[model samples]
Target: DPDTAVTNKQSFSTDVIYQVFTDRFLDGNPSNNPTGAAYDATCSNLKLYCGGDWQGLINKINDNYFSDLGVTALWISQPVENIFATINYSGVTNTAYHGYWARDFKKTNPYFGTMADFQNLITTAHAKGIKIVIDFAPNHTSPAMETDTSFAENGRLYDNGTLVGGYTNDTNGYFHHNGGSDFSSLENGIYKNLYDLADFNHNNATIDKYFKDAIKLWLDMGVDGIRVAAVKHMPLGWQKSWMSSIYAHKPVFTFGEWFLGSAASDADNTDFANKSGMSLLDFRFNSAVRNVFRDNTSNMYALDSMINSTATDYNQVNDQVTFIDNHDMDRFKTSAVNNRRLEQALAFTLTSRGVPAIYYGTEQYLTGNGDPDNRAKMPSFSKSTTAFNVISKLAPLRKSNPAIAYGSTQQRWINNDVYVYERKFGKSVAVVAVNRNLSTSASITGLSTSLPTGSYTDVLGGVLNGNNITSTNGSINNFTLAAGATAVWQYTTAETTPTIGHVGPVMGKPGNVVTIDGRGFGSTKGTVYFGTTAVTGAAITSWEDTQIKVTIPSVAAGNYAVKVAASGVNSNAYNNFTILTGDQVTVRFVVNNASTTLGQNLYLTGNVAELGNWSTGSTAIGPAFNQVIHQYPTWYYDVSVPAGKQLEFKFFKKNGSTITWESGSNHTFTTPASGTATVTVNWQ
Candidate 1:
């Protein structure tokens, strides 16, 4: 019970997560390893069960393995029961020891442990201040369940026996399925199919009830977070709505799997966030870390590219759980080769913006390459050796210093062999430098670290190359790094709160005046964007300590997370603003300049949600006020509008399916006061 206190189900972040695979990490109970005589029990088969079980992890937790390593969270593979046995990748009939395939949504797998054992694991983990999370698969089910058909036949509702929603007479309707996914496109496409895995039809109520109930059961049992597996195969909109149901029960921390990590993947992940309100693992950062540090031919700026990309494409970088390698990729040690670079890689993740997660054997120096080799049994952890001490010191320091844990990464200097950066929060700072050359040194001058000089210390071992240090010298300091070295500087102050900006027009569609109110915006500016689209510098006519004025960029009309960059660091994206759009037309009849659905009806549409959602129909303008405006030889329609509401609209003529709305960029207007609004159009 003392071990679970690490998280205790409390909300926390920037944690150094330790990922465990139940079948490979430890074997606490020998009886469970041979869970079924038919199940594989040979410690010799690497693909099959190697004897790890829930009791093993619990035993280790009680033994304080996680506490000793400074781990704050444990991300375990799925604990649900899998199909009794399935063929392994190499074509051998094996047990469902990996936990991805499910046989019953209602209970725990036999090999992992009993339900009581599972519950105890959670309870014990919470007491140790450690949060426990499990991998969850909603994308598919085992083919065995698909052919069984009893779940759909039981209390579930079916359209002509085609499964749909909760109804098991429905009190928790029986499960249902439509079919496999088409994978070509989500539009008019069959649900995605991953082969051998049955894709459940999520469109109907019965299918929804099944997953909703499954996830809820875990939360009710005290699981702190869930890592969604194969989310990319499901419809984006549906994936988000499903998570919202889980959130209704509790504000659980969750992340999605995108598998192939890259910069473009970050954009797709962010778009999913804006649409669904969930965070995902930054696989790109993971991929980037491996590429930049493992291979000498990789670009040093690649890391910078990864960091900057997060600002523009991700909703928030803090939740992008960053790691070097996991169950899906080759191990980091395979490349670090017991070099100092391994230390740099681990230190980098601990100090970056996102939460840091470690593959089980990384600290123990598991250097297996590729697939099953990378997943060997986790050797016993030794505190006196390799990574245990590095992680031991960094994780705690990060927890104690918010700047090191929460600040944004800004590149101060980067090159082919040397890379230097600063993590700045408020006025506190952490400077990190990395070098690949074990033969020479890299040094530079005229750098503003935003850190006031007062005897900075290199906690992990680094040498400050030059002097001229002062809080107000107004002089740039010179710094250097030894060959093949990594340094983390502890600034004198980690106290100044960063001045995040507040955006004006608070709402609008691309076109004009918007002011950001706040401080720390520099005169030598960086970049700003409406969502992911960058706005030009000329648009920002004014810049001061507390304010900045700019023209909203001609970007797509939608909500935007306003950001400002300076000295390679970006200010926090404080508020969201909407970009509204409307219709514009040159015609006349009803109201004056526009109108002519005649024998039936004509309407106006734009960004007016209450105005029929920009659709042309009964909500259109009818026979009404016609004003005499001689200007431009066009007729006019004038009506009063509520003040403070921004409106963009267009007139359309139609009685049924045949209709004509205005053409061009929609006209946009923000009313100053309650008064007559007018539009003039030439007859169409």
Candidate 2:
């Protein structure tokens, strides 16, 4: 499930996300403001931190501000402690108020309020059915050298040959400052300096563990998922390992911020999800349709082609985080030049594909020009705004109509200024239209809506019943929209419902693969679940509109239910698959030690149960590297571990009760996806 089902939230597509920068969201408690660093509230200096804190967010959450907005999830700023003192960036010395300059990975920034405040926010959020998604800064950190641990600069700088706890196990340092690679040299993939922020040394194994552990710490703190920042700056292999480690914990939804939108950017971002096995922010859609609607440069069919290309381009387009305007772009209202266009764009944003992200000040119609301006402080929370009204109408519909929540779009028709599309989930269908023309009416006919030729109600046009638009030849005729407005018509009818006929080879060990027999899966993608666990690795090995093949994830010894969910409709749980706990992998090991004494014996130990976790003061690493082999002072042992897992280990020589360890770096490897593997190592 890269999936966690919490409170009123399912995974991924179910959320209507609200993106809020912590310092600018609100000021629930004023006494917690910073003293040494610059903090202002006039919006006069956009670079400085506003008084918004965790308490402010908590205040809003408790005030039912999010609930009234119909938002189900929140993507808040990185709450990790950042550099305390301001640093020189583009010749301006500013503090890490935006919260990206992390000086410590283990603690929350005190300015956001203490640990109790953090826990309370999540607690209240869960009670009200909202999931909390924390922003993660994985690629770089603040370049500041401050020593206020409260802000993380207290000991956050690591180029000084120091470490925060074990954050940087690299004895040398944690950053790559000068190795001849510059910002343009992404070829080496290590030259990226996100605006002179200290780039992390990803080549160092310690850096991987730091981030891996940091993410788990936040998840352990009851956060729902993560929105990874600057992932492109790291190598693809490293990203894969990092996420795989995360999935090893539990299935929680994660996405990346790769903010580019060219087709090259499309391929690059698409390649990221395929290569790294994670979802993304749809900057391609962002780049493709922004000017078409905002600038009036092209036809609405361009939006159709963009949607179809996205469907073909990524494996997880339904789950990609989608937005109209964000922190990096000018506010939609700013570019829209009027409220009609703003409403037009947001209707498509909410009703189109992927999870919609409503930026902080967007609901208030706060228009800003660029970076610092776009990330402005929150105004008073009011439910009377036009954006709020639109959200209330469309966002909650996601949960009610299966088609709008998890379905594929079929272009009913396209016009120069108006576009009509239909969403289908089995028998459920939602027809959506958005007009970009302010003064003229755009009309279309002969649109294949996949609905029965009959009368239906229009949801958004206020014709809830009886005022019908008749269909002909399996298509709707003469649908029109005027004055840059929107329309939504939803209906249901008996159709080809998806079914779970049966499952095969129902009994197997943990790593075994199986087939699910079903019908009506159609083109829309779905997931296979082994009990509550999502079958890991690539999606389905084979998928058809009728059948699918998926590997069995590691389920415990029990009779478990297996099912498939597609187009927002889950098939009946087939109570068939049975798993045996003994199903595991054989990890063969060979260690050559020609210098070993005749009476000495070699043993293997590691962080996993198979290797005794290097347990000390006990007799456990049992019989591992115990004897001579091939007559060359070599010892061998075939160890066992759960399939599809990664392990870290070391070698040691044991004599009686005393042991000696070979030192340097820990050895590690990941088993095959279907999880059995072999390895040989000499004393290091």
Candidate 3:
């Protein structure tokens, strides 16, 4: 419960954020579609309209999609009027259905419903206890092509005729056309891109008031925040003034989109937002986590190092918005390009520091190459519930646990395969284990913390066990994880019910196989079911202290066991006895002599189900030791019998124990009546 509400009263942490692209969400009213209007239908390649409206969101409000998911807020696409006309360039198609290409700040897009629909959206979200944040684009407006003439009609004119160069207008101009110049240029000059959208001249007093007033309009509608788009290109001083003016009207949380790296320029953008009393989205951390979690070898950790190193002088780490993949980038599942370590990456993003924003449809295994594909309509909410469920579970933990949401983060383990870390604040602590290995298990160790001794539940796995943990007066705990597994364990004083042993073997030779069994092996941690070779998906069969029978796939002879390491709460070593083979069993031998004449050379042949160590044998009657094959539970080989000789065989355990013979005769088989005869024996 309610007792778990964040009570620290410190700075708020960015734990869980849900992102939605409004256009693709749902079409509450299909009547609003602009069928064959100037809106480009041929731009279907670059842009496709999926009629979603505010009413659809309103319908879902009571469903508790956000509350059930532990979502603290909603980040919807910009809800302003988009370019009303289609810009058809024969080969290049650009549409404003996504709300990024703004036409006017004064009105809402009728295509997305009416102004009342948007107002109702905000009111309904607040009523449901979900905070709403809309996209705020102050950079530029859509080009004055075949698009709606609202901007022109509203007397929006730039200072200069040319769409480039320095800004200077005599007739109280509100716009500046940047003539095809890259924004990278530090020199003061106009800039433009492929789209001929006229950028706002924030230097103009009229333009500044217009943008600030538009924000006030929404804030008055009960919107909790605004996501400022393209803050990098906007004039910093003017942006500061606009933010100051907006905040004066109401307390609004804001974040700016600074696309590139967190450079001095990027930091300057963030600094400007903060200076203006608004927060800047942490694009640096987002990109860093994306690269690090996907490749595990990128300079991602450098971003973390940068945050840690710089947090002392500037509190940028806490304010940063961390994400793995967003609308602008390739879908994370696809961006990783089927590398298949996405689950681990997601875990890292969710449980790590900063505010975490989960792009919609990630949990359903959505994959898209780039921008448009990355913004596909989300699958039915019922189809993929894993990501949503996990996010829902983490929301409260992040909200309640100070160590997770706002605590100082210390990297405990990092390497090519795994990333382990801890978030701590005084007596509260949380540990995160992320496994990024593609084909093998990864072990994370040296998690040092000073929390009391007790069992901690892994909120993700729902497994509560003391053996899965270890601590040195709250100093260090070790975690062994399989590839793509993520474990988040929280400390608790009282003990919970122990987890049932779920173990099994992967492969082994028949008779020579060792059976392991155990139950309630209390407090013993770091226990592993080992084999001669590592198994991929092994299972545990029978369990008991005296004997544990494991079914392993047929393999070469070797030692295996249920190994318990001395660490954590259970620091003790326990090993079982090894199995050996007996003489009654023949490695490779032929059965009945039926193929050759009395004087001709004939051979008895049989296939060995369990081969121990011997690779080859020359003699007809080979000793079990001389032709010792490694005992694998399921193995096969050929045995030979001399000409004109009857052969008898019996299976032997790897422990040199003889298998019981059939009542009438030993396990025997007749050789084929041909030049080289072969015999086959069946054993259970």
Candidate 4:
């Protein structure tokens, strides 16, 4: 019931978002390729563009990529028909592949697919429990072009009372040709006609109905949300009215593309959107995250402070959407040169207290220097790297844990290079520790020291531990961390038994005090115990359904479960549960891993061994080969050795330890002899 009403109209606690560009997502129909264009089937070359369509996105949805990552929503770029003719800008000649340069609002882009294709994409996404958020461009349309008839003719005519023969003018009233003004001025003021884009005055009744109807059409087609483009350029009063109208039909969520970077304050935008029944994308957080994660002077500590202090007030913070890299900015991974530290950046974004949206190719290590490249096609899913797996792992954790989704965030630890924070909701908590230092280890402390004792798991690295965690009574749990690594720990109390006989009387006349028997009672004393608190001071007449029944202890009116435990073990807390008074209870005991408590120290031993291997290669091996007496033999062997010869050695874990061999399970050592020879090795 607590999950039902967290916000004004939305029911969910968190959102897992996957962003896709309509042109680059997929090319379901090769026949639709441009007439004079060279089609590259390989999809490898960055210079060559591949046509991806709505049907292609539908294919990925059917493939369960969304479901696998626990994605609750999909954000696709504008799907409207783009300007049909090729438009050249500066020195770069780019096709309108991203779909932002729309020529028409009433029609779907043939390049993307048909209306049915768009409908199917939405329907399929919704069927798999994923909501759809389409990009809506309310600002400038495509530049002066031939195929786009609404702008070319009327645009120049209204500006200078001369009819241009080359321009095609339909006079749809969509164009405000205010005498050839700059593109930036298109959204700034009231004009008779502005640039080529036919900016409709939303205050007009007919124009307002047209825009709202277009939005409602998508919602009726199963779109759960919309990302309004160039929101600042549009009138705020009109946006408020439009959002209210759209939200009334269904629980439609909206976020605006307020493009102000750190230079502009988002408070006004946030307040207006919230009051209008919509939300604004936290662009300031996006910029801060990019800078801090890249080893710049702006680190995670600064980022945490900036987000907490500047983004939003307490009431609206949870509703804000946070992202690192988007289509408009430099790709974080590419900007950081594919450094693993970006993983720490991503972990911070996903685990922090807001809706997280990941660009489609980010997980595949896709890097683009600027706009078009940043908006490249989705990478091959098969080549997805650790970043992809990171998103997949954190998605569900964000959903299942309310603390992560809607809790108040507190920065527990902050330094020049590291950031540690906890998201707390009542008794539940989720902690995130990020180390931005590239080469040095970060000593992260002051995490929630009050977290209940249990085995916490590192969702990023798949590492599990319990020992490094130290918590105070009713406080947060704390731990240390390494550079580029993030650890998330969730603490929850065992489920209690549901009380019985609160609303109605007992079927059988049972005495006030009774005892029922069962086996395997835990010996741990001073453990919290529970039973149905609905019947206070009632005695159990008999025991049935693998349960023990005794007179309910006099307690406050509330549902309760019978559980016995004190200082529950970490990572193994799920083993404890309390069954209802009359329901069947199956008791299964599990042994917890004792070695998993090493926490951050668990990797210290393995790291030392790896460093030792490097030391042996550079020192021990380097000295033997440097001897003058071995020079002749070394020359002879070098001449006889194969072109790609590699010396291989094997290291074992003392031959008796439980550790398994890791991947790439070999150590390379330079061999003295050139020809193949059998050698015997003895190990003590």
Return the TM-score for each candidate structure: 0.68, 0.72, 0.63, 0.64
Better of 1 and 3 by TM-score: 1
What does candidate 1's lDDT look like per residue over 315-389, in tens digits?
A: 556656888788877787764454566767887888787778888977787777776778788776677654666
lDDT of 3 by residue, 321-364 (tens): 67777888888775434434555556666677766777877766
Measured on C-alpha atoms, candidate 2 has an lDDT of 0.66
Candidate 2: minimum summed lDDT over ten consecutive residues — where?
1-10
lDDT of each: 0.61, 0.66, 0.51, 0.51
- Point out where model 3 deviates above 4 Å: 1-15, 37-46, 145-171, 187-195, 261-276, 296-314, 335-340, 443-446, 462-467, 475-479, 492-684
Ten-residue region with minimum lDDT total, candidate 1: 582-591
Which window of 10 residues has the lowest lDDT sum in candidate 3? 1-10
Clashes of each: 47, 9, 63, 31
lDDT of 4 by residue, 1-684 (tens): 122111112422366778877667777777666544423455443334477777787887888767776667888878776656554446445566667666556667776788888888877876776777888886555566435555322222221222212234534444444444344432233232234444554433345555666676667776766777766655443564455445435445567776656723555555444433456677777778867766375765668767666534423455567787788887777553545666666777888866788887777777786766676667677535566677777877765665676566887777887666777754567777666665677554445444665555555554211124545653444445654566776664322322110101011011222221112222222222444233322243223221223443544322334432323521111111112112111111111121222211111011121112223231111111111112211210001111122434332221223332223544343422211222222211
After superposition, the stretches of candidate 4 with alpha carbons farther than 4 Å from their true spots are 1-13, 37-49, 90-92, 145-173, 179-196, 263-267, 311-315, 335-338, 444-448, 461-468, 472-479, 493-684
Candidate 1 TM-score versus the reference:
0.68
lDDT of 2 by residue, 124-164 (tens): 88888789988888887765222233332433443223454
lDDT accuracy of residue 189 in candidate 3: 26
- Candidate 2's TM-score reads 0.72
Q: Is candidate 1 or candidate 4 better by TM-score?
A: 1
Point out the higher-scoring one by lDDT: 1 or 4.
Answer: 1
